[PDB]
Each structure stands twice: as structure tokens, then as C-alpha cells.
Amino acid sequence: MVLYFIGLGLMDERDITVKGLEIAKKCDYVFAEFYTSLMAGTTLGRIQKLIGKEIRVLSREDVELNFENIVLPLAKENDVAFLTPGDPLVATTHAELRIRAKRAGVESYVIHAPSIYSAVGITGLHIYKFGKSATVAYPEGNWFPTSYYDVIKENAERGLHTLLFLDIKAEKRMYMTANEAMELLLKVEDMKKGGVFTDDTLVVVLARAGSLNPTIRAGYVKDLIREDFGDPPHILIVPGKLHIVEAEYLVEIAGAPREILRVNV
Amino acid sequence: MVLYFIGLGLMDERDITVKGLEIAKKCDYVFAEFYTSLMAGTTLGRIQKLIGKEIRVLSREDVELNFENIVLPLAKENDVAFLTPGDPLVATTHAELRIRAKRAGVESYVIHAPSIYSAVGITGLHIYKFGKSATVAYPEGNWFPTSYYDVIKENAERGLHTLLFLDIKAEKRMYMTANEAMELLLKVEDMKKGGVFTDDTLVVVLARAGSLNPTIRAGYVKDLIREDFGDPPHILIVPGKLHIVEAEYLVEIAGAPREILRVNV
Numbered sequence A, B: 001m002v003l004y005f006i007g008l009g010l011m012d013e014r015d016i017t018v019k020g021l022e023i024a025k026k027c028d029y030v031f032a033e034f035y036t037s038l039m040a041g042t043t044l045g046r047i048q049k050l051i052g053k054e055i056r057v058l059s060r061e062d063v064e065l066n067f068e069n070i071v072l073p074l075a076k077e078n079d080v081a082f083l084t085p086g087d088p089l090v091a092t093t094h095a096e097l098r099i100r101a102k103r104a105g106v107e108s109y110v111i112h113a114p115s116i117y118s119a120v121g122i123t124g125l126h127i128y129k130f131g132k133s134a135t136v137a138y139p140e141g142n143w144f145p146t147s148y149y150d151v152i153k154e155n156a157e158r159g160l161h162t163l164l165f166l167d168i169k170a171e172k173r174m175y176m177t178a179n180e181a182m183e184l185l186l187k188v189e190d191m192k193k194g195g196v197f198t199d200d201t202l203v204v205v206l207a208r209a210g211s212l213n214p215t216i217r218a219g220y221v222k223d224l225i226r227e228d229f230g231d232p233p234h235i236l237i238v239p240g241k242l243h244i245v246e247a248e249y250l251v252e253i254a255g256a257p258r259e260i261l262r263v264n265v
């Protein structure tokens, strides 16, 4: 009868909400995609075991090109669920699928889950101080994306923090590390030379948020750029002007150099 | 010897994650605060029942002034949980509590849950397009705050959406409605004459995010200012220029006027 978009959360199958779990358990058919983000390798088997249903995993093409041919037809006479990493509508184009559902006469409901977008709170940076967000995309052949560099500049000018989602090419098992993101940014700085991202820029890295032991590190690019932050997924953040307590947390919790405790108001 | 910061999610007792619930159940002591926000879709009783643990509620003062003498002492020799609406560490001052834990020789871990920061994705507005966030505060006595108006201006100016949290008096259970927020913004507009918020401004209202049947409405202030958006909580969003896909979602899913497809894109 209906279609449920259910988020699985940040890191593993236990990041699903009780609400999402109880609803998924009652669905006739269950689909999912694992290309918009990276979760624990054992999330599928465990979530299948958790909801007690066989789950059909869909590729980006299956969804973007054939969602209304593979999933919607079933949601016409059965309760169907579509599982996704984190929150289904954050930094994805899945919201458009609700429009496809409506046009096919299918009612849809959304069950949220922990998202990397709000998990940034664990970095100690005030979430209301984040400005426009951006994605550091892998260059492709002669194509070298750079717009994310301009986002940092725009936010920095306003004293706002910049959240940088990192690229992912699931079919190729490619998950961009904060290290790779920093290298690309230094390359763009070389071209544009705007003094936006350099070896002296303070950055914050959050790896495997949602796990009980995520890696939270803050420091200068020259120091962080070759540091091991553990397995992906990773996000990179370029803070703007820091409040005293933000710097204090970065130093006490994220191991930032005590030098940042001193803020130039 | 361990303190767990656990989010309860958006609206009711089922918005906690499986991870959060299982951990809370194994804690010797469980504390909670409902001053940053209130779980309007449930009660303390229903949450206690789900967790199967007595829950000691803490006031703003208990937390802000005495966290280290109320919560931390017990965490030194037992597993303790601190429950908060939404996602932990989203509230501006909560991150600092982890510093207090460290200073007390107490380890702390964070269990995430859905936050309105990410749940607003259900409005169809791209998360990356959101800029700085603000809170609409009730004017009091001789104090007439207006910074939230300047935030909208700075974001909209750069084509970014503005997430506006509405004033709440948890203790008195007083919630500012989207309707009241709009009236206030018009009053502020009449004072600053910035051409930022008028009867012709397109806004989005999201009420009861997290529930299976949230109220999602989009339209011009002149039309929505007296519309019934249902029971709180309400969040107001003033989007910047829309991507055609965002506009289509608002029209098809949020009942927005066809007009936005030409006027606000």
C-alpha cells in the first residue's frame, strides 16, 4: 500500500531508530542502497537478520533510472521499505523519489536516522555556525571540480564553518579520505591562490562517526595531511572564526595544538 | 567509569536508535533533560517504560551548573546515561560537558539520533544549501532582538536557506508557533526595511518532524501566516532561490503554489 524511506544511520545496523526497525519488520518487501555512503561491511547481513527479511540491494542506476519500475510497482499492493545509509534525504537526491512515488499513486513516509550532517556536533563546533556545505569530488579525466574551494572562502569570510562531504564511488570501492581531500584542496589553492586553504589552515577531521570510537582530530594541514585517521568514511571541516569553548573542545577532545586556544577576536 | 550521551531523537520514544536503547538499558543510572527541547509525541512515562529504567530528570541549572556533582560522580564507578532530545551535542553548550567528563577522569561516548538539522531534508530543500542557522526569540520588556533577521538576509543574499528555530519555554511548556514567528519577522521588517521578510516572502513550515505524519507546508507569508500547522513543535525555513527540483518537491509534496516554479527559481 505504501513506501517507507528508512534511514539506517551513521555507521551500523544499530543506528536505525526503533521506529524504523519496527516498521521495517512489518513491510512485505525491503530494498536498500549502499552507494550514497559507507556503513559497516556487516550492516546488510545483520540488518537482514535484525528485520528478519531478505533485502534486495539496488545500484545507483537501478534507483535513478528504474526506481518506478522496480520498487514502486510493489508499493501498489504491498508495504515496501527502501533503506539507505544515514538519513535518506540528506546529501542525496532521494527526495525526488517521493515525487515519483506520488505520480505513481503511491503514498510515501520518511523515517529519519542519525546523519553525518548533525553528527558534526561531536567536533565541538557549534552547529548553528556552519554555513553552506560542499562536496570534494574526485577529478575525472581532464575535469577538475573546484567549486567546493569557493564555498570555504565564502563561509570563512562570514566567520562560518564549512562541512565538506567527501566523494564516494561505491561500485569502484573508492571512498575519499580526509587526506586525499586536503591534497586536492592544496592543489586548488595553488591554482586560485586565494589564501583559502594552505599548510597553515586549521582543519577538523571526523572519521567513522556513529561508531563508539570515532576518530576526531583537529590541527594544521601541514600536520594532519599525512596522518592516519583510520578507515573511511571521513568528512573534512574547515572552521571559521572560533568561539573560546569551540577551541577548548578541539584541544581537549580532538587533540588540537594548544596554540589554537588563543583566538584572534 | 563511563558516561553515555544518548540522543532520543525527534518526537517520540521510538526515535531513539537501537544502539541507544540497548546501551541505555545496560546503564546503572539514567539521566535526562527536557529544557533544550521537549519530546511532544511522548511522555516521560512512555520513555521510562521503553528503557525499563528509572529516569532522573535534570533542569538547566542541574546540567549547566552542577553536571559534575550530579552526573559525573556516579559515572566514576558505574555506567551512566544522559538522554537528550534530538542528537547529542547539537545544543550549543552540551559539547562542553565532555570536557567536564575528561577533567573528572570519566570516559564518555556519544550515541547519535535524528536531529531537526538533518530531518529538515524532508522539506525537499537541499541540505548543502542551508547557511547559518538562528533562533527567533520573543521580544521582552525593552529588549527587541533582531539578529535572526540579519542571518536570513546574509544567507538569502548568497542563495542559501535559513533554518529558524522557534523560541520555547520548556519549563512553562510554551512553544512559539510558526505563525507567531512570521508576525515577528514582519514587525522586524517594518523596522529595518531591508526587504528581507515580507508578505511576498516564500517560507516553509515543518511541524512534528519525526512523526509518520508531519505537517510540511510551503507558500507565501500572506497566505500561511494564519494557517493552522497543527501542534508544536514548529520550525520555520526561509529558503533562498530554489533549484527547480526543490520547487517541484515543495509543490508536489508540501502543497506549495504553482507560482513558486517561476517566481522563486
Ligand SMILES: Nc1ncnc2c1ncn2[C@@H]1O[C@H](CSCC[C@H](N)C(=O)O)[C@@H](O)[C@H]1O
Pocket: A010, A011, A036, A037, A038, A085, A086, A087, A088, A089, A090, A091, A092, A114, A115, A116, A117, A164, A165, A166, A167, A168, A206, A207, A208, A209, A210, A233, A234, A235, B118
Ligand atoms: N559515519 C560517517 N563518518 C564520517 N563521514 C560520514 C559518515 N557517514 C557519512 N559521511 C560522510 O558523508 C558522505 C556521504 S553523503 C550521504 C550522507 C547521508 N545521507 C547521511 O545522512 O549521513 C561520505 O562520503 C562521508 O564524507
Ligand SMILES: Nc1ncnc2c1ncn2[C@@H]1O[C@H](CSCC[C@H](N)C(=O)O)[C@@H](O)[C@H]1O
Pocket: A118, B010, B011, B036, B037, B085, B086, B087, B088, B090, B091, B114, B115, B116, B117, B164, B165, B166, B167, B168, B206, B207, B208, B209, B210, B233, B234, B235, B236
Ligand atoms: N520534531 C521537530 N519538528 C520541528 N521542529 C523541531 C522538532 N524538534 C525540535 N524542533 C525545533 O527545534 C527547537 C529546539 S532546538 C533542540 C534540537 C535538538 N538538539 C535536535 O538535535 O533536534 C524547537 O523550538 C523547534 O523549533
Ligand code: NA
Pocket: A127, A128, A130, A131, B117, B130, B131, B132, B133
Ligand atoms: Na547547517
